[PDB]
Design a protein around this nucleic acid. Structure first.
Ligand SMILES: [Mg+2]
Ligand SMILES: [Mg+2]
Ligand SMILES: [Mg+2]
Ligand SMILES: [Mg+2]
Ligand SMILES: [Mg+2]
Ligand SMILES: [Mg+2]
Ligand SMILES: [Mg+2]
Ligand SMILES: [Mg+2]
Ligand SMILES: [Mg+2]
Ligand SMILES: [Mg+2]
Ligand SMILES: [Mg+2]
Ligand SMILES: [Mg+2]
Ligand SMILES: [Mg+2]
Ligand SMILES: [Mg+2]
Ligand SMILES: [Mg+2]
Ligand SMILES: [Mg+2]
Ligand SMILES: [Mg+2]
Ligand SMILES: [Mg+2]
Ligand SMILES: [Mg+2]
Ligand SMILES: [Mg+2]
Ligand SMILES: [Mg+2]
Ligand SMILES: [Mg+2]
Ligand SMILES: [Mg+2]
Ligand SMILES: [Mg+2]
Ligand SMILES: [Mg+2]
Ligand SMILES: [Mg+2]
Ligand SMILES: [Mg+2]
Ligand SMILES: [Mg+2]
Ligand SMILES: [Mg+2]
Ligand SMILES: [Mg+2]
Ligand SMILES: [Mg+2]
Ligand SMILES: [Mg+2]
Ligand SMILES: [Mg+2]
Ligand SMILES: [Mg+2]
Ligand SMILES: [Mg+2]
Ligand SMILES: [Mg+2]
Ligand SMILES: [Mg+2]
Ligand SMILES: [Mg+2]
Ligand SMILES: [Mg+2]
Ligand SMILES: [Mg+2]
Ligand SMILES: [Mg+2]
Ligand SMILES: [Mg+2]
Ligand SMILES: [Mg+2]
Ligand SMILES: [Mg+2]
Ligand SMILES: [Mg+2]
Ligand SMILES: [Mg+2]
Ligand SMILES: [Mg+2]
Ligand SMILES: [Mg+2]
Ligand SMILES: [Mg+2]
Ligand SMILES: [Mg+2]
Ligand SMILES: [Mg+2]
Ligand SMILES: [Mg+2]
Ligand SMILES: [Mg+2]
Ligand SMILES: [Mg+2]
Ligand SMILES: [Mg+2]
Ligand SMILES: [Mg+2]
Ligand SMILES: [Mg+2]
Ligand SMILES: [Mg+2]
Ligand SMILES: [Mg+2]
Ligand SMILES: [Mg+2]
Ligand SMILES: [Mg+2]
Ligand SMILES: [Mg+2]
Ligand SMILES: [Mg+2]
Ligand SMILES: [Mg+2]
Ligand SMILES: [Mg+2]
Ligand SMILES: [Mg+2]
Ligand SMILES: [Mg+2]
Ligand SMILES: [Mg+2]
Ligand SMILES: [Mg+2]
Ligand SMILES: [Mg+2]
Ligand SMILES: [Mg+2]
Ligand SMILES: [Mg+2]
Ligand SMILES: [Mg+2]
Ligand SMILES: [Mg+2]
Ligand SMILES: [Mg+2]
Ligand SMILES: [Mg+2]
Ligand SMILES: [Mg+2]
Ligand SMILES: [Mg+2]
Ligand SMILES: [Mg+2]
Ligand SMILES: [Mg+2]
Ligand SMILES: [Mg+2]
Ligand SMILES: [Mg+2]
Ligand SMILES: [Mg+2]
Ligand SMILES: [Mg+2]
Ligand SMILES: [Mg+2]
Ligand SMILES: [Mg+2]
Ligand SMILES: [Mg+2]
Ligand SMILES: [Mg+2]
Ligand SMILES: [Mg+2]
Ligand SMILES: [Mg+2]
Ligand SMILES: [Mg+2]
Ligand SMILES: [Mg+2]
Ligand SMILES: [Mg+2]
Ligand SMILES: [Mg+2]
Ligand SMILES: [Mg+2]
Ligand SMILES: [Mg+2]
Ligand SMILES: [Mg+2]
Ligand SMILES: [Mg+2]
Ligand SMILES: [Mg+2]
Ligand SMILES: [Mg+2]
Ligand SMILES: [Mg+2]
Ligand SMILES: [Mg+2]
Ligand SMILES: [Mg+2]
Ligand SMILES: [Mg+2]
Ligand SMILES: [Mg+2]
Ligand SMILES: [Mg+2]
Ligand SMILES: [Mg+2]
Ligand SMILES: [Mg+2]
Ligand SMILES: [Mg+2]
Ligand SMILES: [Mg+2]
Ligand SMILES: [Mg+2]
Ligand SMILES: [Mg+2]
Ligand SMILES: [Mg+2]
Ligand SMILES: [Mg+2]
Ligand SMILES: [Mg+2]
Ligand SMILES: [Mg+2]
Ligand SMILES: [Mg+2]
Ligand SMILES: [Mg+2]
Ligand SMILES: [Mg+2]
Ligand SMILES: [Mg+2]
Ligand SMILES: [Mg+2]
Ligand SMILES: [Mg+2]
Ligand SMILES: [Mg+2]
Ligand SMILES: [Mg+2]
Ligand SMILES: [Mg+2]
Ligand SMILES: [Mg+2]
Ligand SMILES: [Mg+2]
Ligand SMILES: [Mg+2]
Ligand SMILES: [Zn+2]
Lengths: 99, 138, 83, 208, 99, 124
RNA sequence: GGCUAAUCCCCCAUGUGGACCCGCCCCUUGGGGUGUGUCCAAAGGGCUUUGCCCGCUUCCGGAUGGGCCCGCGUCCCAUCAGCUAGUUGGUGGGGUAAUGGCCCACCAAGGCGACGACGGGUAGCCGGUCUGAGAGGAUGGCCGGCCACAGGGGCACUGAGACACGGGCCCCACUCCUACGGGAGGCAGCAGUUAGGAAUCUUCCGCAAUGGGCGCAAGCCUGACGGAGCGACGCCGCUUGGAGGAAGAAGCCCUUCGGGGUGUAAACUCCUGAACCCGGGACGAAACCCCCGACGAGGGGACUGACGGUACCGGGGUAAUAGCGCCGGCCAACUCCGUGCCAGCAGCCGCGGUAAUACGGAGGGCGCGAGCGUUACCCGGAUUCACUGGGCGUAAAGGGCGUGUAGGCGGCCUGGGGCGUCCCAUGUGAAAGACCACGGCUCAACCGUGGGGGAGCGUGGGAUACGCUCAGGCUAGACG
């Protein structure tokens, strides 16, 4: 069972390395309601096939660099540019809450 | 909007019955219809109806009470002594077969929504499924 | 390397041994790979020896090494009995 | 070193008859023959409405005293009776009545509970043929509790025994007065014993 | 005092010595051979590479190296040599190299 | 609070302070009277109370109360501190244990003797 | 400086095979197969001596033990809000059993954070334990597992394996030797000392058992370990007696001066017989070895016990330690003196300022008993952090109001998918522990054997009502 997930591509900015945003629900061990939570994976795009806003299955793989342990599996979906501009706005938001 | 359809159903019933009404319109749903089918066959409502009010679909819910009390306060004994929602929009509750409660010493019921469809605790239990726990009735 | 031995089990002055497969480097009484029998040296009850040949035959086949006290118990149980 | 020191004081506090002395507790002495008041200076005083506590504690003490037993022992037994499946009060009586020392008494080999304790501790009794000296020891049914063969001529044994000839014995037991041997065949229900204890009060006492 | 099988230490030196001047011997030759490749002299190069490979495997006979650091060094070298043999090389000896 | 509030922020387990630094968590601590004397109590009560400021193995210098009917303590007696306090005068978080180190036990006390640290007397 | 042996070190051959570069076959990350070149083997020793045993060598498996890597889980502070230059990625290379910025050279400009990054504080995790109806809280001594350390900090060597507690090197601190040049240590192994502290043991016996190293075996080593000792530290069992015995002795307390109380308690009578003395006396130990066989299977024989002359058995035998807390209400248990806001008690209400069931002593009583009190710390009560399971008009508590960002939530009907959710099978959930059952120590504590339960995660299969999601449609909400 070599673990595999799904996500969106939120980053172009590395050679052969994309960043994938992967969410999951799971119910709250105490207050008991589902919580939606998420994590970012740097993944291996050898030939720079995947572009941004794509939805991709992602896989457990022998190590590539510090930070890079998963290689792109397939292309599930093309251009969900909404999740993208979403995460991107969260990030723009960090810019408040400051000094 | 209406944030829980269902709750509001149960409530309509509740304030309805408390004020001793012979029956009540509630706004119509295939699901809310299941639930009253269960609620009915199981003894608590006189039964219900599929109505149309002002060109819109409603279910009339006819309403049952026990006989006339003596002494002061002749208001008759409620049948639907209590009805309450369990799963709630944004806080959900799903139960194993081993986790399905049982109610007021068996004198009441639970309503579960399963992939066998909507059924009572007893029904689920003999069916052997779990599900979202809709409501406590007794 | 891998060994069939005894592990001390009952209380003080009341020893009950567990007949057991495990790496030599292990602690005596520490975690072990399979329990293959019990042996009660002071013969307190009708049956002070359980072996279950079947399985100790295995470990032997795959390169298990019995300690001789273990071997004696084993062979009392005719793990070894050849025909 | 469980209670050793004047008894008929306890017969008295507890305000109902206890047979801690055996014979004479049947006489016109048990002290509850005309002096049934509680002990001490203020024992002849008009007394006061009992706390709900008092009542349940005193009901405990009434049973504990009856059987001769330490608190730690008594409790640890009751705990052990909770745990068991079955009605907790009744089991408790079961377990009490199954103490060796009590069987020895209730088999009639001794005049009194304490007497059976000594009887036991000193070696005069055999359970299924081995000498067994601890009054704690739990008599299983099927078990045969009998007097030690080497001890069979003792005065005390014969007094007791010989003048048990013909009296009927507890219906969960059997006696043979020739062998000084008897069988514990079953377990006493709460109406097999008679005790003047409502046990449920004792359950209630440990519930706190 | 005096634990007598500190003798082990006493040996480990003699041993250390041996190991070092195997390794080194190897290292030197390898370098030399590789060098001769970039000078294009594939006669001389192949000859030396060949001796280096003997030595490496021979020193894997013992505790010195063993393993696959056998193979590793072997592979590394032979490639860097062949790969270094075209700036136009016509691989003369081909003692060691697979036609 | 809503649920989404309990997931967001959620409840706060709250802790309790200690009524004493005998420190260590130590059950008792050894000390030295620095000074000894008599004080006036609080609110409804009158009295002359017996106490000793004591310096500690725990490093702090505290006021402890000498229990029971007489006492023997003075400039540098050395004594053991148990703590438990006196409501009716203030600054006293701890009692002295009588009968240990340089503090005597209360003599003549027939009645409750473990507290007060007096040996059991014999007779005829 | 000089001889010298080997299972020590080399060189040559043999190549079953393996290793490496290149080519193709299958396969899918560096998995197999194959051809071409190249490169690689070895050690003897013992006997019942011509054939057996203990060894060596290259390969392929097994087995056991590990490395490394990923999902998930894993304390407080936001009065810690930004952090990052090997930083984040890429090509080449070093290195290693192996991946990887582990390191290095040159390119790109990234990585991370309110889903709490960075900082600070604290802490070895776990099986489990304590408490609790449960949910939770709290904890990680003993036993098992995993990690880390070995006076503080660095480092590597040898090796299957270490960056090594009784190995090596350097720096530092400390101690000791010193011809002042220079040298030697490392109890967080068992004992023991000292210091610190409220406080924590014997410089004991044994190698009989079990277990580990080496050894063909005999054996040797084994403060692992089996045992003994000391501490009421805990838990469990047991004793200080059993039956009689007064209308109820002296003493002592109370007194309405008649009597009430301790109290069947004592005395005394009669049984029993802890301690102690005598005798007998284990199991734990049967293999290694040796003999027949064939050094196998199998059969026969021999030795060996620290605990210990202990356990236990039989005989004899003495009436044989009881204490501590409480008695104003929470709370079971009351009277007399003494005392006079004093002396004192006090967990909290509060007691004491001359009739104190509240201080102190007495008689009596209540509770426990070889124990009973105390202080300390956890959980309980405390539904007083409220998931179960609280609140906000005046009790503490609605922001001064608005706009919307992230986020939470989402009408009616139909179809797809099946992520949440539900079910079934299966793998994992070590042992210990807990639960139940029989059993072993005379019981028990303690111990065995068996059975059962299990959340959770992996996998396969299934259901689709509710949640999601994708496609369609509607108009009761919203807007126009
Ligand atoms: Mg790109
Ligand atoms: Mg890379
Ligand atoms: Mg791929
Ligand atoms: Mg920024
Ligand atoms: Mg479930
Ligand atoms: Mg070992
Ligand atoms: Mg190991
Ligand atoms: Mg057998
Ligand atoms: Mg029960
Ligand atoms: Mg019966
Ligand atoms: Mg009776
Ligand atoms: Mg009754
Ligand atoms: Mg309770
Ligand atoms: Mg040597
Ligand atoms: Mg050189
Ligand atoms: Mg709430
Ligand atoms: Mg006052
Ligand atoms: Mg002094
Ligand atoms: Mg206190
Ligand atoms: Mg003293
Ligand atoms: Mg007092
Ligand atoms: Mg020389
Ligand atoms: Mg070949
Ligand atoms: Mg070849
Ligand atoms: Mg060669
Ligand atoms: Mg060699
Ligand atoms: Mg095999
Ligand atoms: Mg393996
Ligand atoms: Mg493995
Ligand atoms: Mg592994
Ligand atoms: Mg650089
Ligand atoms: Mg730097
Ligand atoms: Mg690289
Ligand atoms: Mg930047
Ligand atoms: Mg996150
Ligand atoms: Mg912690
Ligand atoms: Mg720490
Ligand atoms: Mg429990
Ligand atoms: Mg709580
Ligand atoms: Mg729990
Ligand atoms: Mg923890
Ligand atoms: Mg420790
Ligand atoms: Mg441990
Ligand atoms: Mg591990
Ligand atoms: Mg260190
Ligand atoms: Mg280390
Ligand atoms: Mg030290
Ligand atoms: Mg160091
Ligand atoms: Mg080695
Ligand atoms: Mg090496
Ligand atoms: Mg290595
Ligand atoms: Mg070192
Ligand atoms: Mg050391
Ligand atoms: Mg040194
Ligand atoms: Mg030490
Ligand atoms: Mg000291
Ligand atoms: Mg010790
Ligand atoms: Mg010795
Ligand atoms: Mg041995
Ligand atoms: Mg051995
Ligand atoms: Mg060997
Ligand atoms: Mg020989
Ligand atoms: Mg030695
Ligand atoms: Mg030991
Ligand atoms: Mg001591
Ligand atoms: Mg002591
Ligand atoms: Mg202690
Ligand atoms: Mg008198
Ligand atoms: Mg009189
Ligand atoms: Mg008597
Ligand atoms: Mg008599
Ligand atoms: Mg006699
Ligand atoms: Mg003899
Ligand atoms: Mg023996
Ligand atoms: Mg034998
Ligand atoms: Mg041997
Ligand atoms: Mg031997
Ligand atoms: Mg022969
Ligand atoms: Mg022979
Ligand atoms: Mg044999
Ligand atoms: Mg034999
Ligand atoms: Mg001896
Ligand atoms: Mg003797
Ligand atoms: Mg005897
Ligand atoms: Mg006798
Ligand atoms: Mg006497
Ligand atoms: Mg007597
Ligand atoms: Mg109480
Ligand atoms: Mg009272
Ligand atoms: Mg005065
Ligand atoms: Mg006066
Ligand atoms: Mg006055
Ligand atoms: Mg007065
Ligand atoms: Mg007054
Ligand atoms: Mg008084
Ligand atoms: Mg008081
Ligand atoms: Mg008093
Ligand atoms: Mg008294
Ligand atoms: Mg005890
Ligand atoms: Mg205690
Ligand atoms: Mg508390
Ligand atoms: Mg509660
Ligand atoms: Mg409140
Ligand atoms: Mg409100
Ligand atoms: Mg106000
Ligand atoms: Mg206000
Ligand atoms: Mg307002
Ligand atoms: Mg305001
Ligand atoms: Mg606002
Ligand atoms: Mg708004
Ligand atoms: Mg929104
Ligand atoms: Mg909907
Ligand atoms: Mg559908
Ligand atoms: Mg699903
Ligand atoms: Mg389908
Ligand atoms: Mg596992
Ligand atoms: Mg388990
Ligand atoms: Mg259970
Ligand atoms: Mg038994
Ligand atoms: Mg057990
Ligand atoms: Mg199990
Ligand atoms: Mg199971
Ligand atoms: Mg469970
Ligand atoms: Mg569990
Ligand atoms: Mg499963
Ligand atoms: Mg379908
Ligand atoms: Mg949504
Ligand atoms: Mg639509
Ligand atoms: Zn009586």
């Amino acid at each position: 069972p070599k673990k595999v997930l799904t996500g969106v591509v939120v980053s172009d900015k590395m050679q052969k390395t994309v960043t994938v945003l992967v969410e999951r629900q799971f119910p709250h061990p105490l207050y008991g309601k589902v919580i939606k939570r998420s994590k970012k994976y740097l993944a291996h795009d050898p030939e720079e096939k995947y572009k941004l806003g794509d939805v991709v299955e992602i896989i457990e793989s022998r190590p590539i660099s510090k930070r890079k342990r998963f290689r792109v599996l397939r292309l599930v979906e093309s251009g969900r540019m909404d999740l993208v501009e979403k995460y991107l706005i969260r990030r723009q938001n960090y810019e408040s809450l400051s000094k | 909007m209406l944030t829980d359809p269902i709750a509001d159903m149960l409530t309509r019933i509740r304030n309805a019955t408390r004020v001793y009404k012979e029956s009540t319109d509630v706004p119509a749903s295939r699901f809310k219809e299941e639930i009253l089918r269960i609620l009915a066959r199981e003894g608590f409502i006189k039964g219900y109806e599929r109505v149309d009010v002002d060109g819109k679909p409603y279910l009339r819910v006819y309403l049952k009470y026990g006989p006339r009390r003596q002494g002061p306060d002749p208001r008759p004994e409620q049948v639907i002594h209590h009805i309450r929602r369990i799963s709630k929009p944004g806080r959900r509750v799903y139960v194993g077969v081993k986790e399905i409660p049982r109610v007021r010493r068996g004198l009441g019921i639970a309503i579960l929504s399963t992939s066998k469809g909507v059924l009572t605790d007893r029904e689920a239990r003999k069916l052997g499924v779990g599900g979202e726990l809709i409501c406590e009735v007794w | 390397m891998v060994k069939i031995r005894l592990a001390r089990f009952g209380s003080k002055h009341n020893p009950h041994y567990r007949i057991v497969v495990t790496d030599a480097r292990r602690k005596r009484d520490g975690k072990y790979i399979e329990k293959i029998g019990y042996y009660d040296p002071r013969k307190t009850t009708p049956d002070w020896l359980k072996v279950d040949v079947e399985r100790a035959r295995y470990w032997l086949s795959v390169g298990a090494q019995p300690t001789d006290t273990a071997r004696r118990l084993l062979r009392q149980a005719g793990v070894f009995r050849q025909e | 070193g469980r209670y050793i020191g004047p008894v008929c004081r306890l017969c008295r506090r507890e305000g109902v008859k206890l047979y801690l002395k055996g014979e004479r507790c049947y006489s016109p002495k048990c002290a509850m023959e005309r002096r049934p008041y509680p002990p001490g200076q203020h024992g002849q005083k008009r007394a006061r409405r009992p706390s709900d506590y008092a009542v349940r504690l005193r009901e405990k003490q009434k049973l504990r005293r009856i059987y001769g037993i330490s608190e730690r022992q008594f409790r640890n037994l009751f705990e052990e009776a909770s745990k068991k499946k079955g009605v907790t009060g009744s089991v408790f009586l079961g377990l009490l009545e199954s103490r060796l020392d009590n069987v020895v008494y209730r088999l009639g080999f001794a005049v009194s509970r304490r007497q059976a304790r000594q009887l036991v501790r000193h070696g005069h009794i055999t359970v299924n043929g081995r000498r067994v000296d601890l009054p704690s020891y739990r008599v299983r049914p099927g078990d045969e509790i009998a007097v030690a063969e080497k001890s069979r001529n003792l005065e005390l044994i014969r007094q007791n025994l010989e003048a048990m000839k013909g009296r009927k014995v507890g219906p969960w037991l059997s006696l043979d007065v020739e062998g000084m041997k008897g069988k514990f065949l079953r377990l006493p229900d709460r109406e097999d014993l008679a005790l003047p204890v409502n046990e449920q009060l004792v359950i209630e006492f440990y519930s706190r | 005092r005096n634990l007598s099988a500190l003798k082990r230490h006493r040996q480990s030196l003699k041993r250390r010595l041996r190991n070092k001047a195997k390794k080194s011997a190897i290292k030197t030759l390898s370098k030399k051979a590789i060098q001769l490749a970039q000078e294009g002299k594939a006669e001389e190069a192949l000859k030396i590479m060949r001796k280096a490979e003997s030595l490496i495997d021979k020193a894997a006979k013992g505790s010195t190296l063993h393993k696959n650091a056998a193979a590793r060094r072997k592979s590394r070298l032979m490639r860097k040599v062949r790969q270094l043999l075209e700036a136009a090389g016509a691989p003369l000896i081909g003692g060691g190299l697979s036609a | 609070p809503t649920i989404n509030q309990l997931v967001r922020k959620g409840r706060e387990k709250v802790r309790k302070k200690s009524k004493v630094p005998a420190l260590k968590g130590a059950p008792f601590r050894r000390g030295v009277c620095t000074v000894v004397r008599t004080v006036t109590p609080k609110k409804p009560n009158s009295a002359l109370r017996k106490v000793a400021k004591v310096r500690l193995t725990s490093g702090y210098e505290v006021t402890a109360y000498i229990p029971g009917e007489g006492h023997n303590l003075q400039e540098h007696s050395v004594v053991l501190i148990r703590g438990g306090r006196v409501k009716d005068l203030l600054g006293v978080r701890y009692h002295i244990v009588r009968g240990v180190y340089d503090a005597a036990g209360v003599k003549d006390r027939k009645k409750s003797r473990s507290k007060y640290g007096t040996k059991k007397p014999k007779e005829a």
